[PDB]
Design a protein around this ligand. Structure first.
Ligand SMILES: *[C@@H]1O[C@H](CO[C@H]2O[C@@H](C)[C@@H](O)[C@@H](O)[C@@H]2O)[C@@H](O[C@@H]2O[C@H](CO)[C@@H](O)[C@H](O)[C@H]2NC(C)=O)[C@H](O)[C@H]1NC(C)=O
Ligand SMILES: *[C@@H]1O[C@H](CO[C@H]2O[C@@H](C)[C@@H](O)[C@@H](O)[C@@H]2O)[C@@H](O[C@@H]2O[C@H](CO)[C@@H](O)[C@H](O)[C@H]2NC(C)=O)[C@H](O)[C@H]1NC(C)=O
Ligand SMILES: *[C@@H]1O[C@H](CO[C@H]2O[C@@H](C)[C@@H](O)[C@@H](O)[C@@H]2O)[C@@H](O[C@@H]2O[C@H](CO)[C@@H](O)[C@H](O)[C@H]2NC(C)=O)[C@H](O)[C@H]1NC(C)=O
Ligand SMILES: *[C@@H]1O[C@H](CO[C@H]2O[C@@H](C)[C@@H](O)[C@@H](O)[C@@H]2O)[C@@H](O[C@@H]2O[C@H](CO)[C@@H](O)[C@H](O)[C@H]2NC(C)=O)[C@H](O)[C@H]1NC(C)=O
Ligand SMILES: *[C@@H]1O[C@H](CO[C@H]2O[C@@H](C)[C@@H](O)[C@@H](O)[C@@H]2O)[C@@H](O[C@@H]2O[C@H](CO)[C@@H](O)[C@H](O)[C@H]2NC(C)=O)[C@H](O)[C@H]1NC(C)=O
Ligand SMILES: *[C@@H]1O[C@H](CO[C@H]2O[C@@H](C)[C@@H](O)[C@@H](O)[C@@H]2O)[C@@H](O[C@@H]2O[C@H](CO)[C@@H](O)[C@H](O)[C@H]2NC(C)=O)[C@H](O)[C@H]1NC(C)=O
Ligand SMILES: *[C@@H]1O[C@H](CO[C@H]2O[C@@H](C)[C@@H](O)[C@@H](O)[C@@H]2O)[C@@H](O)[C@H](O)[C@H]1NC(C)=O
Ligand SMILES: *[C@@H]1O[C@H](CO[C@H]2O[C@@H](C)[C@@H](O)[C@@H](O)[C@@H]2O)[C@@H](O)[C@H](O)[C@H]1NC(C)=O
Ligand SMILES: *[C@@H]1O[C@H](CO[C@H]2O[C@@H](C)[C@@H](O)[C@@H](O)[C@@H]2O)[C@@H](O)[C@H](O)[C@H]1NC(C)=O
Ligand code: NAG
Ligand code: NAG
Ligand code: NAG
Ligand code: NAG
Ligand code: NAG
Ligand code: NAG
Ligand code: NAG
Ligand code: TC5
Ligand code: CL
Ligand code: CL
Ligand code: CL
Ligand code: CL
Ligand code: CL
Ligand code: CL
Ligand code: CL
Ligand code: CL
Ligand code: CL
Ligand code: NA
Ligand code: NA
Lengths: 527, 176, 352, 176
């Protein structure tokens, strides 16, 4: 029976047999006052503190959010939907510790992605007990507010200042600073890690001064704040806050009145209108995201990046080989998970309309021009592959590569990887390739579980990834030093070396997507 | 190994087995089949071409190294045999430029480009294709050992072909 | 010493650890141990470092051994705090008496109960901590003796004796490898034979006798001390490496055994300065000079002898790998000790 | 000065020591002495430094000299705190009067009683401390005069006079 006392009270955990060993899980420890009522839309507040013993023996509620109902009964999509009740009262974190209680363990803190509109730390692919069993690190993850309830902004106004969910992430990192040594953790060795919006989040904590002393290093999976979906301009943010006001009949004249009104609507009604705060939208819409609030984020982050203002420490950044594929079956004419989606040229053109809504005609032709001159005009899946590349390179790959270059230029070691293994168990079709989100399970160690139908080659890839990640976290270098592994070079502006992750040989290459990111990065931002 | 390494101490032969047969992982049935082709390629052709080029580049001259990895759509030998010995020749000579002849589009394109790199080397001492936005072919140096891969899709700059294997053929084996 | 030494006149801010064989291994692990990081300033490593193959026990073998011990003292239990509670009742002699057998084959260099990765003194495999630069940053002086491996041959290798000259045969050498490399694939063992027995030339009778001492020195002490020092120097700090090659005029073991393991210690401690004691002039001189280099390292982080026109001791760098030879005649700067042999121990062997 | 100079308007954080001949030697040893390390910022050395051959006395000669002094003032004892206790009774003039003879030959540049390695102000031979970089790290200004040695010749070298031009011969030079 395992009780540990925290600044805020006592908590009891639960024992778990993992790979003939034991890990102790403390699931659902709260970490702020629930943000209800007068608290809805505001920065998270001090956890007040309990006598008695909190039982942290189940996952807690997920924050309120819309669910994906595009493919009901389909594991591919439904594995991302929340798997505990939704509730405004959702500010809880989990801790996983090795048994016996370690003495001064390195801490991995996961930030889930979800477009800032969705996600929960209790997904199966985010289970921290393999890491803690196998590398005897500690693993912490947090639920943070998503959608309007976490990122609604009316700037300057503390009733709705913006970035609420980013400060919930922040107050969780404070909670580990204050409390983790009690579970055996080293607060001086914390690595943040995250995927997609959770990676974007990690990147902004690197820019945020209030985070600067709550962690040591950073991992960025398929995401960084300079991605085009990751930050909302102050313009659009008020437009959206007021479009929301409109839609819930809350338009007012006093702005503390709009908020006061909005703080009365039921959850379902805010959720139900989020999708429409915006005229055209796309499968990659982020209607309520991070903003420059003068508080968490003191200036446009692209400026802060360029001018070297951010935490100086090492970063590990990566992307998957087919990032863009997963979003095509949510709206691009011709695309299906249930056939092979050979689309035509005219369909590709229509696709650009779905993905690049407004979006000058010359903008769109220039993408066509870049992506459709091939070698050669023969192959039927030419147009199908090109549209996935537009979307991967634009939305994820080129921005992760430019973050890493700008970041490495100021001095610190960075490592870049290029993940290209397709999971033997992937439920989406072949044509969709090495999809977005599908490294997560390798990073968390799921394939180490033999009982589970992954290949030998996959267990091996996983065991090695897990060791590189845990070496980065403790040592700032992601090598696997024992099993004659390919050495992972640092990424520099100049040679731009990266390491490829696959079940066969892993290689050192140079200048991923060189010709394509020259398009996205220098020319496109102009159209 | 007995057929290919006739005389050939027993320790010689085990050491080849040792080098080539510890894998990741023991699962795949064609493990042993692939390993024997590699023993024979790396020993007989690849490691010695790579060591010639290093020794030669060390004295001063520009060298270029390529790694051909396209399997001819018309190859008459079985699939498992892969990108075989002798089967670049036809690309170098231009046979796939003859449309009349049942090679893919992608193959004509690969050929036309090879032919131009070879003819640029011959006239200019540099095998670039300069017109069609082609990947630039670095010189090979002792140090980074860069090579260019030739295939119908993208051609890449890589480093240190067969590094671990030629360390075996080149430093250790000559001793057995 | 941190708490108390200033009372005896000591500077707690100037402490050098020094040690030989397992004591050197120990010094090396205090360099890796965070709890030691602030209890000393610098480190000396004589014939030893934690990456030697006998210096650290894997968690696997350790429990195997703890339970084999439990077995052997009828203490096997089911509750582990029970095995210990039991073991805490046995008389000393009984634990000692069974130590040798916690292990199926063993060898003259067995270390049945050693350091382990306990998550406390040693937070990860030390080879990883070494490679990734996690250890106290300060200067190190590392060295080995010229015939490290000889002393262990007369404890078990067929043909060997302190009481004759031990000219062994090829078949005896092969048997020797069985004693020293117990389990130990056959190809492993042939490959050692292959490396160490192709000579120039097949004539000399003590060919096989010398080769077996070299297998054992280079494997167990020399190559691992040299690789510790390279890995360590690669992160920034000054290191000095020496190669001790003086045979004590008073050595009681036979000539063929050469400059043995353990036999620098007396030079380092100053015993030959005691004239009353039957060491040569040349030996007093060697000692007085060693003592001064060691004491200069400790106080100044540089082991020079600055007064008596002495050969200057270069730092060891990955690249030139310079070392200094210690003998009664001239001491020299050389390069890349045991280059061909440690390429064998260090890159290839760990694979067999 | 550390304790009191700010009262007169001084910056204790900006102190330069300066000195000539033995005073320069002194400055140089304060650079080596840990107890001085934080009582000044920088150092000037005029015609002098502790590695000059007259600037430091070996522990050997020092006891020889202390006891030769003891002898000469009838203070030889067996208890050394007794020699000192004795010496602490002699009048000043008597110590001064015997200083010159604590030493068999001496020269115009004799330093019969100087700095020594005492384990306190000076923790090791200073030449070692110099070579091995153990001394205050700060800037130094050092200098010498063009005819340093001339002044000592008229105190003993045969042929030399302040009152004529001292053209000496080869045999005189040798005597010098
Ligand atoms: C800022 O918001 C306005 C508001 O428009 C909206 O009203 C909201 C409640 C919501 O329902 C939304 O879907 C609706 O469009 C946007 O104005 C609209 O722009 C489009 C094309 O520009 C027109 O066809 C609409 O008729 C027009 N609506 C109104 C009522 O004016 C405006 O576009 C937006 N800014 C951006 C850049 O997206
Ligand atoms: C692959 O499927 C797409 C997807 O649309 C369909 O899913 C199919 C399996 C189909 O049978 C039907 O249930 C569903 O509409 C097919 O494209 C569709 O084709 C029609 C013309 O019938 C369009 O007007 C539809 O809107 C269009 N769907 C989309 C997403 O735009 C696509 O044709 C199919 N192609 C194949 C088999 O290669
Ligand atoms: C881990 O220990 C076992 C235990 O074996 C031993 O029992 C101990 C009490 C001790 O007396 C010991 O000498 C005895 O062998 C080892 O198993 C043994 O392995 C050898 C060869 O592998 C066999 O011939 C023995 O019969 C076998 N003994 C038993 C009782 O199983 C085991 O080898 C060891 N692990 C390693 C890698 O050394
Ligand atoms: C050098 O001595 C070894 C050591 O073994 C012996 O010590 C000798 C001095 C010997 O007289 C005897 O007291 C003791 O056994 C000799 O090897 C031994 O030879 C025998 C054959 O008689 C083997 O069966 C022994 O086991 C073997 N000993 C060992 C250690 O294996 C060795 O022959 C001898 N050689 C000389 C004189 O060159
Ligand atoms: C260490 O001191 C001795 C002591 O000698 C001296 O007695 C002193 C009181 C003083 O008066 C002094 O001038 C007198 O010499 C030195 O021994 C002397 O050495 C010289 C030549 O070596 C001889 O001619 C003297 O006779 C001899 N005197 C005695 C009484 O022994 C000794 O030289 C000195 N060490 C050094 C290196 O200078
Ligand atoms: C320069 O003077 C030296 C110094 O000695 C003398 O000082 C003179 C001015 C001289 O008249 C006298 O008062 C005093 O001795 C002369 O050398 C001296 O010469 C004599 C020979 O008479 C030696 O035996 C003296 O000891 C010697 N003195 C010294 C210092 O050794 C020197 O000759 C004179 N030379 C000139 C004028 O060039
Ligand atoms: C636990 O270790 C503390 C600091 O360790 C870290 O140093 C940091 C700057 C960072 O590099 C981390 O990754 C290092 O591991 C130490 O000061 C504490 O006192 C320690 N407490 C213990 C051992 O319980
Ligand atoms: C004794 O000296 C102290 C420090 O000396 C050391 O500086 C260390 C960092 C290390 O390099 C040692 O080798 C140096 O010698 C000083 O701070 C104390 O105050 C001193 N106390 C005394 C003189 O009694
Ligand atoms: C007087 O100045 C103080 C320090 O000045 C010195 O900085 C030193 C490190 C050294 O370089 C000197 O040469 C510099 O001049 C300052 O901290 C005091 O507070 C000052 N007090 C005053 C102005 O009265
Ligand atoms: C907390 O859980 C423990 C564990 O069984 C139980 O004993 C205790 O009463 C629980 N308190 C609750 C559910 O409030
Ligand atoms: C090392 O490889 C072995 C098999 O040789 C295996 O036990 C394990 O997966 C490896 N360790 C790491 C970190 O990859
Ligand atoms: C250049 O590419 C064109 C098609 O754009 C084609 O005519 C020809 O194959 C190319 N020239 C060379 C040398 O490859
Ligand atoms: C210096 O050499 C002398 C003999 O010239 C001797 O007194 C002593 O052994 C030496 N000092 C040192 C540190 O070796
Ligand atoms: C608007 O009116 C209300 C009064 O209750 C208040 O909450 C808000 O701050 C006011 N601001 C102004 C000056 O318009
Ligand atoms: C085993 O039993 C004893 C009870 O006296 C105890 O010392 C030990 O911790 C127990 N552990 C378990 C749960 O098996
Ligand atoms: C010598 O005698 C006196 C006693 O008054 C004392 O001052 C000195 O320390 C003594 N030392 C010894 C032990 O000879
Ligand atoms: P990431 O959190 N970002 C995509 C922006 C909509 O993953 C979405 C599936
Ligand atoms: Cl084609
Ligand atoms: Cl690898
Ligand atoms: Cl690419
Ligand atoms: Cl496999
Ligand atoms: Cl190309
Ligand atoms: Cl290769
Ligand atoms: Cl010979
Ligand atoms: Cl010397
Ligand atoms: Cl050698
Ligand atoms: Na353009
Ligand atoms: Na070998």
């Amino acid at each position: 029976d395992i009780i540990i006392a925290t600044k805020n009270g006592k908590v009891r955990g639960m024992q778990l047999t993992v790979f003939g060993g034991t890990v102790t899980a403390f699931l659902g420890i709260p970490y702020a006052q629930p943000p209800l009522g007068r608290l809805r839309f505001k920065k998270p507040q001090s956890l007040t503190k309990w006598s008695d013993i909190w039982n942290a023996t189940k996952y807690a509620n997920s924050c309120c959010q819309n669910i994906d109902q595009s493919f009901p009964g389909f594991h591919g999509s439904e594995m991302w939907n929340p798997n505990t009740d939704l509730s405004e009262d959702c500010l809880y974190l989990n801790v996983w510790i090795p048994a016996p209680k370690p003495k001064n363990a390195t801490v991995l803190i996961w930030i889930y992605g979800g477009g800032f509109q969705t996600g929960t730390s209790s997904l199966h692919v985010y289970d921290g007990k393999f890491l803690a069993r196998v590398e005897r690190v500690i693993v912490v993850s947090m639920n943070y507010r998503v959608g309007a309830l976490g990122f609604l902004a009316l700037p300057g106004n503390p009733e709705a200042p913006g970035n609420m969910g980013l400060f919930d992430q922040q107050l969780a990192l404070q909670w580990v600073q204050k409390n983790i040594a009690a579970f055996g953790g080293n607060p001086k060795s914390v690595t943040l890690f995250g995927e997609s919006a959770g990676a974007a989040s990690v990147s902004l904590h690197l820019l945020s001064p209030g985070s600067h002393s709550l962690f040591t290093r950073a991992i960025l999976q398929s995401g960084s704040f300079n991605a085009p979906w990751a930050v909302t301009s102050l313009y659009e943010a008020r437009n959206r806050t007021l479009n929301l006001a409109k839609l819930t009949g809350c338009s007012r004249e006093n702005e503390t009145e709009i908020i006061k009104c909005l703080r009365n609507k039921d959850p379902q009604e805010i959720l139900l209108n989020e999708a429409f705060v915006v005229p055209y939208g796309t499968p990659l819409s982020v209607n309520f995201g991070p903003t420059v609030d003068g508080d968490f984020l003191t200036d446009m982050p692209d400026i802060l990046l360029e001018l070297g203002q951010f935490k100086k420490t090492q970063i590990l950044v990566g992307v998957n080989k087919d990032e863009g594929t997963a979003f095509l079956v949510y709206g691009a004419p011709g695309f299906s998970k249930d056939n092979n989606s050979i689309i035509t040229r005219k369909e590709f053109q229509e696709g650009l309309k779905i993905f690049f809504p407004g979006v000058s005609e010359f903008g769109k032709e220039s993408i066509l021009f870049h992506y459709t001159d091939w070698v050669d005009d023969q192959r039927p899946e030419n147009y199908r592959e090109a549209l996935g590349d537009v979307v991967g390179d634009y939305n994820f790959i080129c921005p992760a590569l430019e973050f890493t270059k700008k970041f490495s230029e100021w001095g610190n070691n960075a490592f870049f990887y290029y993940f290209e293994h397709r999971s033997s168990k992937l439920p989406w079709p072949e044509w969709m390739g090495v999809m977005h989100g599908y490294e997560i399970e390798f990073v968390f160690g799921l394939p180490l579980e033999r009982r589970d139908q992954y290949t030998k080659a996959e267990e091996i890839l996983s065991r090695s990834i897990v060791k590189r990640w845990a070496n980065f976290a403790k040592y700032g270098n992601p090598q696997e030093t024992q099993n004659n592994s390919t050495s992972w070079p640092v990424f520099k502006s100049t040679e731009q070396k990266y390491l490829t992750l696959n079940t066969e040989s892993t290689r050192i290459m140079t200048k991923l997507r060189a010709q394509q990111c020259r398009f996205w990065t220098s020319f496109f931002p102009k159209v």
